[PDB]
């Protein structure tokens, strides 16, 4: 299983999201699969971030709640970068 590490911005995003009623179990389920490198359920749209010249990817936890993450295979690490809406991240 890939090591799972977060950014300081991600941590703030989540703290905030939790305060507004976000279900952490939604996150655990998606981050779990990502880290054991299995395909996501059809619901969770997943593609690279175009505009990220570094291999950032974008997962749709909800059609407008995005998990921006980066797999760093060289370190065996899944990096959780941001969690929020398009409007909030971009
Ligand atoms: Zn998308
Ligand atoms: Zn998008």
Automatic annotation (TrEMBL):
GO terms for biological process: mRNA catabolic process; translational termination. It comes from the Bacteria. Gene3D superfamilies: RelE-like (3.30.2310.20). Zn(2+) 1 binds at residues 47, 58, 60. Keywords: Metal-binding, Toxin-antitoxin system, Zinc. One of its GO terms (molecular function) is RNA endonuclease activity. InterPro entries: RelE/ParE_toxin, RelE/ParE_toxin_dom_sf, Toxin_YafQ-like. Zn(2+) 2 binds at residues 58, 86. The active site is at 86 (proton donor). Pfam families: YafQ_toxin. Belongs to the RelE toxin family. YafQ subfamily. This is Type II toxin-antitoxin system YafQ family toxin.
């Amino acid at each position: 299983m890939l090591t799972i590490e977060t950014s300081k911005k991600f941590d703030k995003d989540l703290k905030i999201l939790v305060k507004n009623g976000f279900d952490l179990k939604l996150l655990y389920k998606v981050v779990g699969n990502l880290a054991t490198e299995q395909p996501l359920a059809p619901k969770y749209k997943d593609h690279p971030l175009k505009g990220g010249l570094k291999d950032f990817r974008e997962c749709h936890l909800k059609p407008d709640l995005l998990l921006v993450y980066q797999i760093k295979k060289q370190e065996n690490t899944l990096f959780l970068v941001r969690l929020g809406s398009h409007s909030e991240l971009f």
